[PDB]
Design a binder for this molecule. Sequence first.
Ligand SMILES: O=P(O)(O)O[C@@H]1[C@@H](OP(=O)(O)O)[C@@H](OP(=O)(O)O)[C@@H](OP(=O)(O)OP(=O)(O)O)[C@H](OP(=O)(O)O)[C@H]1OP(=O)(O)O
Ligand SMILES: [Cl-]
Ligand SMILES: [Cl-]
Ligand SMILES: [F-]
Ligand SMILES: [Mg+2]
Ligand SMILES: [Mg+2]
Ligand SMILES: [Mg+2]
Length: 134
Amino acid sequence: TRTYDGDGYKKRAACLCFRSESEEEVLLVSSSRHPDRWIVPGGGMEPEEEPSVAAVREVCEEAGVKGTLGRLVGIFENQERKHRTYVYVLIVTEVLEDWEDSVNIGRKREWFKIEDAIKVLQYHKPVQASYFET
Ligand SMILES: O=P(O)(O)O[C@@H]1[C@@H](OP(=O)(O)O)[C@@H](OP(=O)(O)O)[C@@H](OP(=O)(O)OP(=O)(O)O)[C@H](OP(=O)(O)O)[C@H]1OP(=O)(O)O
Ligand SMILES: [Cl-]
Ligand SMILES: [Cl-]
Ligand SMILES: [F-]
Ligand SMILES: [Mg+2]
Ligand SMILES: [Mg+2]
Ligand SMILES: [Mg+2]
């Protein structure tokens, strides 16, 4: 069930999943519709779901990782697609081998240096590239 803010924007949550507290390498996942493209793992908030809870759940489902939830980086609008995403830091402490989206849709995951994550996100996901702006 998709949820919406009062202005009709779809409610989403995502994490920047870092390998360590140095926040130098981030985990991206493949697009479902276009597997040759990279995205930041995230998705729709459920009814009455706290954004931090949705972020952690979506990262588990799409990236198959768990870790220590850190700060809210910010709330990011995509005007073109009419969605609003809460973006958190997550420091990865558990990497699971057979996760929901790997089993169900063959979703891939890969570590990127921050500069390279920004580069691969720019063309199709410029708002996601902006999550790393600080
Ligand atoms: O079709 P796009 O390229 O506009 O993006 C797709 C994106 O596909 P992707 O970014 O993977 O190409 C999906 O993401 P996902 O299939 O990788 O999960 C994403 O879904 P979402 O991440 O908001 O939703 P859920 O993760 O499932 O909760 C949205 O799909 P949905 O809203 O039909 O569930 C999104 O569509 P819009 O909200 O219209 O932008
Ligand atoms: Cl790191
Ligand atoms: Cl986006
Ligand atoms: F999902
Ligand atoms: Mg999802
Ligand atoms: Mg998603
Ligand atoms: Mg979802």
